[PDB]
Structure formats: C-alpha cells, structure tokens
Design an enzyme around this catalytic site. Structure first.
Site, PDB file in Angstrom:
ATOM      1  N   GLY A 157       0.785  -1.212   0.000  1.00  0.00           N
ATOM      2  CA  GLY A 157       0.000   0.000   0.000  1.00  0.00           C
ATOM      3  C   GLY A 157       0.820   1.266   0.000  1.00  0.00           C
ATOM      4  O   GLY A 157       0.340   2.302   0.471  1.00  0.00           O
ATOM      5  N   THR A 164       1.435   3.347  -2.154  1.00  0.00           N
ATOM      6  CA  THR A 164       0.887   4.440  -2.943  1.00  0.00           C
ATOM      7  C   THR A 164      -0.023   5.355  -2.130  1.00  0.00           C
ATOM      8  O   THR A 164      -0.323   6.467  -2.578  1.00  0.00           O
ATOM      9  CB  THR A 164       0.100   3.897  -4.139  1.00  0.00           C
ATOM     10  OG1 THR A 164      -1.036   3.152  -3.679  1.00  0.00           O
ATOM     11  CG2 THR A 164       0.987   2.997  -4.988  1.00  0.00           C
ATOM     12  N   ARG A 208      -1.468   7.501   1.444  1.00  0.00           N
ATOM     13  CA  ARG A 208      -0.925   8.540   2.315  1.00  0.00           C
ATOM     14  C   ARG A 208      -0.045   7.936   3.399  1.00  0.00           C
ATOM     15  O   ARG A 208       1.061   8.419   3.652  1.00  0.00           O
ATOM     16  CB  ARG A 208      -2.060   9.350   2.937  1.00  0.00           C
ATOM     17  CG  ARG A 208      -2.927  10.084   1.928  1.00  0.00           C
ATOM     18  CD  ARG A 208      -3.955  10.975   2.620  1.00  0.00           C
ATOM     19  NE  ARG A 208      -4.879  10.208   3.447  1.00  0.00           N
ATOM     20  CZ  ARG A 208      -5.961   9.593   2.989  1.00  0.00           C
ATOM     21  NH1 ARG A 208      -6.275   9.613   1.703  1.00  0.00           N
ATOM     22  NH2 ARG A 208      -6.747   8.940   3.841  1.00  0.00           N
ATOM     23  N   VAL A 209      -0.524   6.874   4.055  1.00  0.00           N
ATOM     24  CA  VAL A 209       0.239   6.266   5.141  1.00  0.00           C
ATOM     25  C   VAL A 209       1.426   5.489   4.585  1.00  0.00           C
ATOM     26  O   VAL A 209       2.561   5.629   5.058  1.00  0.00           O
ATOM     27  CB  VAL A 209      -0.670   5.359   5.990  1.00  0.00           C
ATOM     28  CG1 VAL A 209       0.134   4.721   7.100  1.00  0.00           C
ATOM     29  CG2 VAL A 209      -1.828   6.160   6.563  1.00  0.00           C
ATOM     30  N   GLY A 210       1.181   4.640   3.582  1.00  0.00           N
ATOM     31  CA  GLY A 210       2.277   3.874   3.001  1.00  0.00           C
ATOM     32  C   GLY A 210       3.396   4.763   2.480  1.00  0.00           C
ATOM     33  O   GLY A 210       4.583   4.534   2.758  1.00  0.00           O
ATOM     34  N   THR A 266      -3.859  -1.151   8.645  1.00  0.00           N
ATOM     35  CA  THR A 266      -5.195  -1.018   8.077  1.00  0.00           C
ATOM     36  C   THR A 266      -6.259  -1.191   9.161  1.00  0.00           C
ATOM     37  O   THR A 266      -6.167  -2.081  10.011  1.00  0.00           O
ATOM     38  CB  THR A 266      -5.392  -2.055   6.965  1.00  0.00           C
ATOM     39  OG1 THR A 266      -4.249  -2.057   6.098  1.00  0.00           O
ATOM     40  CG2 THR A 266      -6.644  -1.738   6.154  1.00  0.00           C
ATOM     41  N   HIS A 293      -8.341   0.117  19.388  1.00  0.00           N
ATOM     42  CA  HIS A 293      -7.970   1.428  18.854  1.00  0.00           C
ATOM     43  C   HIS A 293      -9.265   2.078  18.366  1.00  0.00           C
ATOM     44  O   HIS A 293      -9.593   2.082  17.176  1.00  0.00           O
ATOM     45  CB  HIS A 293      -6.940   1.302  17.740  1.00  0.00           C
ATOM     46  CG  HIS A 293      -6.664   2.599  17.035  1.00  0.00           C
ATOM     47  ND1 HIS A 293      -6.254   3.737  17.699  1.00  0.00           N
ATOM     48  CD2 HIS A 293      -6.744   2.938  15.725  1.00  0.00           C
ATOM     49  CE1 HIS A 293      -6.086   4.717  16.830  1.00  0.00           C
ATOM     50  NE2 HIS A 293      -6.378   4.260  15.625  1.00  0.00           N
TER      51      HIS A 293
HETATM   52  N1  LIG Z   1      -4.145   4.319  13.548  1.00  0.00           N
HETATM   53  C1  LIG Z   1      -4.414   3.527  12.523  1.00  0.00           C
HETATM   54  O1  LIG Z   1      -4.609   2.315  12.664  1.00  0.00           O
HETATM   55  C2  LIG Z   1      -4.477   4.135  11.177  1.00  0.00           C
HETATM   56  C3  LIG Z   1      -5.071   3.409  10.191  1.00  0.00           C
HETATM   57  N2  LIG Z   1      -4.980   3.758   8.875  1.00  0.00           N
HETATM   58  C4  LIG Z   1      -5.439   2.801   7.829  1.00  0.00           C
HETATM   59  O2  LIG Z   1      -4.514   2.771   6.778  1.00  0.00           O
HETATM   60  C5  LIG Z   1      -5.184   2.368   5.557  1.00  0.00           C
HETATM   61  C6  LIG Z   1      -4.655   3.209   4.427  1.00  0.00           C
HETATM   62  O3  LIG Z   1      -5.032   4.583   4.673  1.00  0.00           O
HETATM   63  P1  LIG Z   1      -4.568   5.707   3.640  1.00  0.00           P
HETATM   64  O4  LIG Z   1      -3.155   5.448   3.248  1.00  0.00           O
HETATM   65  O5  LIG Z   1      -4.938   7.047   4.174  1.00  0.00           O
HETATM   66  O6  LIG Z   1      -5.484   5.393   2.372  1.00  0.00           O
HETATM   67  P2  LIG Z   1      -5.213   5.825   0.857  1.00  0.00           P
HETATM   68  O7  LIG Z   1      -6.508   5.816   0.121  1.00  0.00           O
HETATM   69  O8  LIG Z   1      -4.395   7.069   0.861  1.00  0.00           O
HETATM   70  O9  LIG Z   1      -4.308   4.607   0.352  1.00  0.00           O
HETATM   71  C7  LIG Z   1      -4.906   3.292   0.309  1.00  0.00           C
HETATM   72  C8  LIG Z   1      -3.872   2.276  -0.100  1.00  0.00           C
HETATM   73  O10 LIG Z   1      -4.521   0.983  -0.192  1.00  0.00           O
HETATM   74  C9  LIG Z   1      -4.372   0.469  -1.492  1.00  0.00           C
HETATM   75  N3  LIG Z   1      -5.559  -0.300  -1.846  1.00  0.00           N
HETATM   76  C10 LIG Z   1      -6.866   0.098  -1.729  1.00  0.00           C
HETATM   77  N4  LIG Z   1      -7.723  -0.804  -2.133  1.00  0.00           N
HETATM   78  C11 LIG Z   1      -6.935  -1.871  -2.535  1.00  0.00           C
HETATM   79  C12 LIG Z   1      -7.250  -3.136  -3.061  1.00  0.00           C
HETATM   80  N5  LIG Z   1      -8.491  -3.553  -3.282  1.00  0.00           N
HETATM   81  N6  LIG Z   1      -6.222  -3.963  -3.358  1.00  0.00           N
HETATM   82  C13 LIG Z   1      -4.975  -3.537  -3.133  1.00  0.00           C
HETATM   83  N7  LIG Z   1      -4.559  -2.375  -2.644  1.00  0.00           N
HETATM   84  C14 LIG Z   1      -5.598  -1.573  -2.362  1.00  0.00           C
HETATM   85  C15 LIG Z   1      -4.161   1.696  -2.365  1.00  0.00           C
HETATM   86  O11 LIG Z   1      -3.615   1.326  -3.625  1.00  0.00           O
HETATM   87  P3  LIG Z   1      -4.293   2.078  -4.880  1.00  0.00           P
HETATM   88  O12 LIG Z   1      -3.597   3.409  -5.038  1.00  0.00           O
HETATM   89  O13 LIG Z   1      -4.037   1.163  -6.043  1.00  0.00           O
HETATM   90  O14 LIG Z   1      -5.772   2.241  -4.619  1.00  0.00           O
HETATM   91  C16 LIG Z   1      -3.217   2.484  -1.472  1.00  0.00           C
HETATM   92  O15 LIG Z   1      -1.903   1.951  -1.472  1.00  0.00           O
HETATM   93  C17 LIG Z   1      -6.690   2.506   5.827  1.00  0.00           C
HETATM   94  O16 LIG Z   1      -7.322   1.240   5.936  1.00  0.00           O
HETATM   95  C18 LIG Z   1      -6.721   3.260   7.154  1.00  0.00           C
HETATM   96  O17 LIG Z   1      -7.849   2.949   7.947  1.00  0.00           O
HETATM   97  C19 LIG Z   1      -4.533   5.009   8.531  1.00  0.00           C
HETATM   98  C20 LIG Z   1      -4.037   5.836   9.425  1.00  0.00           C
HETATM   99  C21 LIG Z   1      -3.943   5.478  10.843  1.00  0.00           C
END
Ligand SMILES: NC(=O)C1=CN([C@@H]2O[C@H](COP(=O)(O)OP(=O)(O)OC[C@H]3O[C@@H](n4cnc5c(N)ncnc54)[C@H](OP(=O)(O)O)[C@@H]3O)[C@@H](O)[C@H]2O)C=CC1
Ligand SMILES: NC(=O)C1=CN([C@@H]2O[C@H](COP(=O)(O)OP(=O)(O)OC[C@H]3O[C@@H](n4cnc5c(N)ncnc54)[C@H](OP(=O)(O)O)[C@@H]3O)[C@@H](O)[C@H]2O)C=CC1
Ligand SMILES: NC(=O)C1=CN([C@@H]2O[C@H](COP(=O)(O)OP(=O)(O)OC[C@H]3O[C@@H](n4cnc5c(N)ncnc54)[C@H](OP(=O)(O)O)[C@@H]3O)[C@@H](O)[C@H]2O)C=CC1
Ligand SMILES: NC(=O)C1=CN([C@@H]2O[C@H](COP(=O)(O)OP(=O)(O)OC[C@H]3O[C@@H](n4cnc5c(N)ncnc54)[C@H](OP(=O)(O)O)[C@@H]3O)[C@@H](O)[C@H]2O)C=CC1
Ligand SMILES: [Cl-]
Ligand SMILES: [Cl-]
Ligand SMILES: [Cl-]
Ligand SMILES: [Cl-]
Ligand SMILES: [Cl-]
Ligand SMILES: [Cl-]
Ligand SMILES: [K+]
Ligand SMILES: [K+]
Ligand SMILES: [K+]
Ligand SMILES: [K+]
EC number: 1.1.1.299
Lengths: 305, 304, 305, 304
Positions: A7, A9, A11-13, A113, A169
């Site tokens: 992931g 790509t 914001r967090v990754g 996630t 959490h």
């Molecule tokens: N404290 C915590 O536990 C926190 C939890 N999070 C969790 O982190 C996760 C990511 O958040 P964020 O980075 O902001 O989200 P973004 O939308 O910015 O990024 C999502 C990422 O997931 C990938 N992705 C989404 N759907 C799929 C799929 N079906 N198959 C494969 N890859 C997929 C995206 O790839 P692509 O570009 O191809 O869509 C991208 O790399 C969320 O689930 C969020 O809840 C976030 C911050 C804090």
C-alpha cells in the site's frame, strides 16, 4: 534488513516508506502496490531517494507487485486498504499474507489497516506465522499522545512519563492509570494529578482521528512515525514495553483468542511476551467490554473470509 | 553558555571538562586550578581542543586561576578536593565560592567534591546564592546504576525503568522501591521481582567506589558523564526529575535545613522543585537515619 | 563486534576504551594489560560501566592478560608503550602481536604507540596479517586539526574543508595544499587564502604534542577520540578517505616498503586502497624526505627485533 | 525560532512543516493557507502533533490565514503555487510578501514555488527585505543528488564529495566539475573519473522532476527535506556553502541583477556572501546562457 510496505501508494504507506528509509537499521525498503499502480511507485521511489540524498542517508529502494517481491522481507507493513469495508480490507489482508509462513516463517507483519485489531487477527490466521511475529499499530500512538498530555500537565520531560492506553484502537479504549507513573512515582500520588481531567484527555485521543479525517483527509505523519518507532524497536532488538495489538493467550484476566492493544516487550523476535498487567476493577470492566467489541468484530470479519 | 570546572587538573575535573566541551549546549569551558598549575591547564586545553577537532565539535576553552575567570559562568562545577578531609574541602569551597551571588546572582553551582551532600550545604551557605541554584552530584550516578541493574534483571530497555536511590551518597543511601516502575507498572507487580536481590544490588552500588579507588585510583569516567548529564539537563531546560544533593525545606516528611539526595525537577533555573515523594515505613526510617548522619557531618564542617 | 585495547591501564588506553564503549557499533571492549596490572583493570572496568549507565549506553567490558583474551577481537588497538625506547616498544609490539594471523587472519590492528609509523611496520611484519588490516593513527589527528584551523580562517562549517597532512607523525609531516578544498573549491582559489600562514599552522600542529607532554603529561582525550573515529569508520564500513599510517606499495611516486601517513579509503576490510594522490614538486620532495626518515627508523627498529 | 509555511495544505508544504517541526532549532511552526482552507490546517496541525509525540519531540503548531499570523516569523517558507503559471505564482508572492520588511525587517524568506529563481527575484523586489535574507531552494537538491551519484561512483562516504550544480533549477543547469572534489582531491585527478558519464548524470538530475510528476504527481519528500536542511543551516548559523537561488551582485563574472543558483555561505543572517567561484570556459558559457533564460523569464513575471 528489508522492510516491505504494502500500500505504499497511499498517504500512510508513502510517508511510512519515506521515514523508514531514514532509519540506520533499514538497509532496504520495498514499495509494493497493485500491478496497475507500480508506475506511481516509480515516482515515489525517486522522491524518497531524493529525500535520502538531502538527509545524507542511504537505503535501497525496490518496487514490485507480486509475492516474490515482499515475502522474503524482515518486516511486512500492511497499509493497503480503503462493516463491508472491514470485509474488503480483510480480503486484501488475505490476498497478500496467506501462507507467508511457508516461504518465510521468520517474517514479522505490522498491520495498520483499520480496524487494526480485527485485521491483525486476520493477518495472523491467514499467514500461518507464529503469534509473536504478527502485530498491529493498535493503541501505540494513542498511548504516546496520552503520555505527552500528562507530561505537559506536570511540566516534566516526556521521558519521565510512562503510561498506556489498552484495548481497541477506538471508542472502547481504556487508560491504565494503575500503571501510569511520573519518574517512577504513581501518578495518583503526584502533586497536581487532581487537576488532570483523564476523561477529556481520552476524549482528545479518541476523536482526533475522525476530526483529522473530516479536515486534512486522514492521519499520515502521525501513524508513519509510529510505524517507524515500531520497526526500529524490532530491528534493533530494543526490548521496550510498547502497546500494540497482539494475540492474547491468558496473560491478562485469562482473556484469550483475540488481538487487542496490550503492553508487549518487543524485540527482533517480535512479541517477546505480553506483560501480565494487573487492572483495577473499573479498568478490568472497561477492558472486558473492549474485548467483547473486538471479538464480535473479528468473528464477522472471519465469517467474511 | 559558559561552564567553569574548578579542579580541572584532577582526574574528575579534566575528564568532566573534556566531555562537557562536546555538548552542543556548552559553548565555552573555563579550566580553573591553582596558580602554580596553570601550565598544566594549557596542555589540557590543547588536548581537549584536539578532541573537539576529532569529534567535529567546537567550543571555546579558557583557563584561569582567579575569581574573575569563573564568577560570570552559568554553571560552576566544583571538583577541587584534597573529618579532617571534609574540613579542608570545605575551606576550598569557601575560598572559591564565597560571595559569588554578589557578582553573579544567576550562577548555578554543581558540587562533586566528597562528602558531596555536606559540601553542597557549605557551598550554598558561603555562596549566598538561592537554594535552587546550588546542587550536588549526590546519588545521581547511584540511581542510574541501580536503574541498569533493574533493567538487566527484567531484560527491558533501560528507559523503561524509573527508579531512585535517595539520601546520603554513601553507606546510608536508601533505595525507593515504592517509587520504582517498569513501563509504568509498579516494580513490585512486575513478574520476576522476587528473583531480584535488592540488598545485594545496593551493596554493589555503595561499595563500587571503594573498589575503584583501591584499583584504578578513583572514579573518573562515570562521574564525568554524570556531570555532563546534569549540566545538559540544566542548560537545555529539559525538566527531568533527577536525584541530586539539594537543600530540603520540608518537601519530604517536613525535613529541613540539610542538603541530601532527593528527587528534583531540574531546568535552566536549577531546582524547579523537590518532588514531594511519599515514602513507606522502612524507607522513611532509613532516610531519617541518613539525614541524621548528614546533618551531623555538616555541622562539624561548618564549625571549621 | 569486539575491540581489544592493549595498554588499557595508561592514559590513552583508559580514555580510548571509555569512548569506544559508547559507540553503538562496539558491543564488547576487552581491556588488556600485563598480568600484574589486571587488578587495576578491574577498577577501570567498573568506572567505564558507570559511564555507560550515565550515558544510557550498553557494552560488554571484559578483562584479561593473555593472547586468548584479545586474539579473536575484530579490532586490536595497541596503546601499550613507554632510540632505545623505540626498541622497547617494538619488543612490546612483537610480544603481543606475533603470529596473530594464525589464530585470527581477519584481525584489524590499529597502532598508536610512538613512533607510530615505525611500529605499524613492526606490527604488520610480526603479525603476519595482510597489509590492509594493520594501520596506525599516524597523521589522522594532525589532519583533523589542520582542517579546523582552515575552517576557522574562512569561517565555514568544518565539514566544508577537506585537507590532509601526510608523512611521518612528526617533524617531517607534509601538508598537501594541492589536495585541499573548501566546499570543493581549491583552497588556493578561495578568497583570503593569501592571509592563511600555512607554516605557522603546521608548526602549531607539529609542536602541540611536545607542549602537551611538558605540561599536562601527554595526549589523552585527543588521541582517544581519533581512535574512536577510526574504529567507527572501520566497523561501520563508512569508506571515508582518512589519513593513516599504512604500508605503501607504489601507490604514490612508486614509493614502496614503508608505513607512513597517507590517504586511505577505510572500511570493514581495513585499507580498501591508498588513494594515488599526485603531489606537486615541493610536496613530493618533502614527502620523499619524510619517507627517508621513517625507513631508516624502521630499519633500526627491526634490527632490534 | 518560528518558521511559517505558506502553502501548508499542499503536498510540499505539509511535508515540509512536518519535518521542520522535528528540528530542535524550530520551536514553532505556523501553517498558513487561504481562509477557505483553515479547517484542513486544523487536521494537519493535529497530525503533525501526533508525529511529534511519536518522535518524542516538541513544537508549537499554529495556524492562520492572515499577514499578522506570519510576518513576525524568523523564516517564511513559500510553497504556495498554482508563463501564465509564473504570472499567477508571482501574484501569489506579491500578495503574501509585499511590504514584509516594513513590519519584520529581519525576516528570512525561502522560496520554493517554481520557477524558483524567478519567484526568488519577485520575492526580493516586493518584500523590500535585504538581498541577503531572501533565497530560494534553487539547485540545492540538484547539487545533493549529484553529490550522491559521484560518491556512489567512487564508492566513498558521501561527505567526502563536494560538488555543485549552479544556474537555473531547470534545463540550463550547469555542473561545476572545476569545483568538484573527493577528499580534497580534484575529481579530475581521482582514479576512475573517466568511467563517470557527467552528461548522463545531469540528465538524470534535470529530468527526474518531470518523471516524478508524471508518476507520483510531484516531488514531496525530497524537497521537504531540502527545505528542512536549509532552515536548519540558517537557524543554527552553521555557515555551510550551499547552492541556493540568491541575488547576484557581480560575484561571478560581474553578473548582476538576477536571482539564480550560486554557492552561498549561509548563516543566521542569511546569505553571508556568494562565494566568488571561478569557472572554466565551457562552464562560464553555460552559466551565462542560463542567466539569459532566467533574466528574460524574470522580466516577464515583473511586467505582470
Ligand atoms: N491508527 C491507525 O490504525 C491508522 C489506520 N490507517 C489505515 O490505513 C489504511 C490506508 O489509509 P490511507 O493510506 O490514508 O489510504 P489511501 O486511500 O491514501 O491509500 C490506500 C492504499 O490501499 C491500497 N488499496 C486500496 N484498495 C486496494 C485493493 N483492493 N487492493 C490492493 N490495494 C488496495 C491503495 O492502492 P491504490 O492506489 O491502487 O488504490 C493504497 O496503497 C486505511 O485502511 C486506514 O484505515 C490510517 C491511518 C492510521
Ligand atoms: N561525588 C562523587 O561522586 C565523586 C567525588 N569525587 C571527589 O572529587 C574530588 C577530586 O577527586 P580527583 O579528581 O580524583 O582528585 P585529584 O587529586 O585527581 O584532583 C584534585 C583536584 O583538586 C585540586 N586541589 C587539591 N588540593 C587543592 C587545594 N588545597 N586548593 C585548591 N585546589 C586543590 C587539584 O589541583 P592541584 O593539581 O593544583 O593540586 C586537582 O584539580 C575529591 O574530593 C573526590 O572525593 C570524585 C569522584 C566522584
Ligand atoms: N599521536 C600518537 O601517536 C600518540 C601516541 N601515544 C603513544 O601511546 C603510548 C602510551 O602512552 P600513554 O598511555 O600516555 O602512556 P602511559 O604511561 O600512561 O601508559 C603506558 C601503557 O603501556 C603499558 N606498558 C608499558 N610498558 C610495558 C611493557 N613493558 N609491557 C607491557 N605493557 C607495558 C602500561 O602498562 P603498565 O601500567 O603495566 O605500565 C600502560 O598500559 C606511548 O607509546 C605514546 O607515545 C600517545 C598519545 C598520542
Ligand atoms: N523548487 C522546487 O524544487 C519545487 C517546487 N515546487 C513548487 O511548489 C508549489 C506547490 O507544489 P505542490 O505542493 O505540489 O502543489 P499543491 O497543489 O499540492 O499545493 C499548492 C499549494 O498552494 C496553495 N495555493 C494554490 N493556489 C493558490 C492561490 N491562488 N493563492 C494562494 N495559495 C494558493 C494551495 O492551497 P489551496 O489548497 O487553498 O489551494 C496549496 O497550499 C508549486 O508551484 C511547485 O512548482 C514543488 C516541488 C519542488
Ligand atoms: Cl514525511
Ligand atoms: Cl506505547
Ligand atoms: Cl537520577
Ligand atoms: Cl573521556
Ligand atoms: Cl584525515
Ligand atoms: Cl548544495
Ligand atoms: K537507511
Ligand atoms: K560544544
Ligand atoms: K556500545
Ligand atoms: K521542534
């Protein structure tokens, strides 16, 4: 040491991979994404390499979109995600992490996630890895923020405060005042504790996530630094007592068969042990209620497979 | 920031000056000794300047043998030292630190010379400085050593342990298990505490000094790093709760008119406060027994 | 990584061991002394352990007085010493380091005992180690001081200046202005170079040792930090170009069969190579004269065995 | 020290603010954006505060949308940005930085918005600040990237390489091999220099930006760390010789009245001086060709 970020790509990754590359204990960071997103990883790779040059640091930055690209990693960070969302994310966990123990039984997985507690259980179940090598960020950052709030109240160096928020959490998180200290002194005995509103503090910690979501779009720099802290603690075998979502097996109240935020001594081997913290009556009741919410959420998530 | 090291020709002073000069918060170190020992300071100055060059660090190194060379310092580290011993060292304290507050009222004095608790009181009295700006190394190093022993016992990162040895920097030191924690958990509730021999640990802490003297000639690197740790906490206003010799004014059990090892929140203004630590029966009894020894030794030093 | 310090009871050995223990790349420091001095090592061991606790650092501190105690080390630092003195010290080198390559061919030896250039040749000859795993402190510290003097003249951050003093660590040292730069700009082209007196500077570097000897008793904190810098560069495979006393084999002016201060790219393998620096006429003549003094001193030292 | 980041809601500004807040020399960061984007800044503020907590660091994070919220800053980082592009960005520069020196004459402005060299000139003109207190990121990152490529070629520690890309932050950038050294040795005399393709290296440096935009959407972490590096050099008065966009006044070949990438010794007072670097024939010709492009683009920006 190789750290894979699935992931990357997002914001967090993206931000996690950038700050992880800066660690001296991380010699390689592998950016993983869906095959139709690898081209975006090529740009992110260059930008991170530019950051290292500016910081006068070095790391190998590879990219990929298959299991062969990240299965041999030392740490696999899951940041790929979006009731039905818990479904879809759980499926993503499964696709990426099913059967990893067969190719690399020594892999360590850190799930970010959300729901983090549920999805760490999914990750451990599908991975086949030992329970000590699969964790999630959980309430680690929540505990660190609570630590700062207390340190500012007593106006002491942050390192003097030791505290933790355990449980989900989320809304059912539980502060453990019974194991909170300032310079080793139980916080209940510190001058001025009467003027600290624990409930407001917890509220500030519980709602911040949603407030950031509706404004800046979601957490980014906070969670990224927390991931970095966890990976450094592991790869450098620091043996700190950090609060992470881990599989419980009777260490606290004989509670078992759930992944939830708990104190864990963390080293290169992952969870060295869950510290058997003794909770007071109210803390125990709130902790039991939290476990109830996580277990039901975990059951629904697994029913979905 | 300017830090003056009195006794810089000695084992402790020299090593202290060297490590102090490496701190980013220390921009100048002034080496002070007796007039006859000035040339020796010239060589130490050059040796430290070589160390800075090798560490890619910088600091102005000055030397002197007069009051005007150190009175305007932000921190004055007292390492000059020979009951007949306490009397002569108190005379040294008086010679160097009498009337400092008249010329530099914001000065901070760190006493290291033994007996540190006694000579901390001497320094405060003769200095005329505020109680909050005169401290001693006290049981600071003793507490950090005890911390490592507990940490190694539980096999945790050392930062996870918060513990404390209060009272005299000597035989009557008192460990405060009541205020010892691992990750915030009271150490008594941590699994394995039964396998930790507190009394043997305390013996290793209180006896090591004599062992080092009988072998290496005296402590040097340990106390020098402790001085460096204390000075950085002050100059960077970190507000850590460190155990130093400081003037008690009723914060613990209403005990007063004595300088002894106690928890103190330290910043750029010195002792911001002595934490009102609550002690359990046995710890209170031991601390009171230690306050007796220190108060008695302090009166004899003052009388001469 | 294990670093052995022979002569740890002395001013240089004691302070070197203390500062080496603080390095994160050093997990064990072994203090070595004559059997009738080990009791003094027991005190030094405790004092260093106290320093680590104060600095919140960790290292294993062992002690010994036999070959089995230091032969398996990763780095062996020789600080044990006192014409006839060059004899006695050369004999000490021999007693400690003869045949080490038989028990540990991967050992790295850093000689500090003076004459450093001569005794590094002795150490390499008696040790049987490869020429790339035996060096001496040489003109490393001298170069670092010269670097600071130039940086202060031009009032620039020290990291901007790159310079070196090559040759004997003594009267015949040679400054290499031809390979001196400020921010990459040849120092001869920098504004204000005309106001820098190279001769006074070199003089300040050449005599400081004797002046410290007659006053403070000898170098201690300077050489200790230089040793620390060299050991860190090696154990962390940093590949810096540092000026150390190393065995020449034609890399500069076809000069060969001597150990003298020269630029060397240093890593975990020791000397990776002697940089073939090209000297101007005057620099070459001074460098040749320096080699002449070291070779004659080395011959007399070996005749003594 | 207070650092204001204008454009903090954007990719660069947000990341810049986050890493700036981690600096010990930065005690306050002020996030500035348009009034409609204030709530977004509230979330970014909290996210950065979480990062500080996790890094065990501290910083006061403030937010604003008015001049009074940033004019008193020590450093104002300009990251707000949309020939039609330069005109609109110059308008943004003018709106935010017109008349700053009337209220804060000791302010330092760091311009990042592209075209950085042009907008650096715009900022200086409209600001009324001294030439030494207005700079741009320029070819700073370009030079650090070139440094790593040379270092990896010779397999040496990166600190051993000192090199420089001067001129426009764009196609007309000029590498200064004449002032490139490895361990003080002129790079031309270093063994293996023949195997280093300078032209291919320059292409990788000048083309990467377009590649990142076409893929990740634009640079972010690289430029943010460069901003962090520049601000630390200033606030800590390190006096490094870094390549930034600055106003030339005849230091190189008597060229004047242009802001372009040049070597500058940077401290707390800003550009302490532009190093009078001596260029060889070809490098001089390329630099003059780049000064032409920048001067022309600057006049059009000023005209609108
Ligand atoms: N404290 C915590 O536990 C926190 C939890 N999070 C969790 O982190 C996760 C990511 O958040 P964020 O980075 O902001 O989200 P973004 O939308 O910015 O990024 C999502 C990422 O997931 C990938 N992705 C989404 N759907 C799929 C799929 N079906 N198959 C494969 N890859 C997929 C995206 O790839 P692509 O570009 O191809 O869509 C991208 O790399 C969320 O689930 C969020 O809840 C976030 C911050 C804090
Ligand atoms: N509290 C603690 O934890 C520790 C306490 N200490 C104390 O530190 C002090 C110094 O110890 P150490 O450095 O080993 O001793 P040294 O003998 O090595 O050095 C003593 C220093 O005191 C100076 N000095 C001696 N006599 C006089 C005098 N009459 N007037 C002025 N200056 C004088 C010496 O200068 P000169 O060369 O001119 O004589 C020298 O600078 C001792 O009192 C010791 O007990 C030491 C270690 C730890
Ligand atoms: N730039 C440079 O190259 C520098 C060189 N040096 C060199 O470092 C060496 C040590 O200096 P320093 O520490 O001040 O000297 P010290 O007198 O303080 O210590 C000498 C050390 O050598 C040991 N030693 C002496 N004779 C023998 C012997 N016959 N057999 C075994 N061990 C012996 C001593 O052990 P014991 O206690 O049993 O006598 C002690 O460990 C000197 O040769 C000096 O020239 C020093 C500083 C800088
Ligand atoms: N010199 C260099 O090396 C680099 C230059 N840059 C330059 O930085 C600038 C920002 O890039 P980036 O962060 O990716 O862009 P984004 O679109 O991500 O962010 C642009 C920022 O500018 C603000 N902004 C946009 N239009 C206006 C306006 N009319 N008035 C005021 N503020 C405005 C936005 O606020 P809002 O959300 O309210 O619109 C936002 O804060 C660009 O000009 C880019 O070329 C970028 C990277 C490297
Ligand atoms: Cl970031
Ligand atoms: Cl935690
Ligand atoms: Cl303490
Ligand atoms: Cl030291
Ligand atoms: Cl060198
Ligand atoms: Cl640069
Ligand atoms: K790295
Ligand atoms: K300093
Ligand atoms: K160590
Ligand atoms: K900060």
């Amino acid at each position: 040491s190789k750290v894979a970020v699935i992931g990357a790509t997002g914001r967090v990754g993206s931000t996690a991979a950038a700050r992880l590359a800066l660690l001296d204990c991380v010699n390689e960071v592998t950016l993983i994404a869906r095959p139709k997103s690898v081209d975006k990883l090529r740009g992110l790779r260059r930008d991170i390499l530019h950051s290292l040059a500016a910081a006068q640091k070095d790391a190998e930055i590879t990219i990929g979109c298959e299991r062969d690209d990240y299965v041999d990693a030392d740490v696999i960070v899951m940041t790929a995600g979006i009731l039905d969302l818990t479904k879809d994310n759980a499926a993503i966990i499964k696709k990426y992490l099913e059967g990893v123990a067969e190719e690399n039984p020594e892999a360590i997985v850190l799930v970010v996630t959300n729901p983090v507690d549920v999805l760490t259980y999914v990750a451990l179940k599908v991975s086949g890895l030992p329970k000590n090598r699969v964790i999630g960020s959980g309430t680690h950052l929540d505990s660190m923020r609570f630590k700062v709030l207390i340190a500012k109240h007593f106006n002491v160096h942050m390192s003097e405060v030791h505290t933790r928020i355990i449980g989900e959490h989320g809304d059912t998180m539980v502060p453990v005042i019974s194991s909170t200290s300032v310079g080793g002194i139980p916080v209940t005995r510190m001058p001025g504790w009467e003027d600290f509103d624990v409930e407001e503090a917890v509220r500030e910690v519980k709602e911040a996530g949603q407030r950031i979501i509706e404004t800046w779009g979601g957490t980014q720099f906070g969670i990224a630094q927390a991931i970095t802290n966890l990976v450094r603690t592991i790869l450098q075998d620091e043996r700190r007592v950090l609060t992470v979502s881990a599989y419980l097996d009777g260490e606290i109240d004989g509670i078992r068969d759930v992944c939830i935020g708990v104190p864990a001594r963390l080293g290169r081997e992952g969870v060295l042990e869950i510290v058997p913290i003794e909770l007071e009556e109210d803390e125990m009741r709130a902790f039991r209620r939290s476990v109830k919410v996580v277990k039901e959420a975990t059951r629904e998530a697994m029913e979905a497979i």
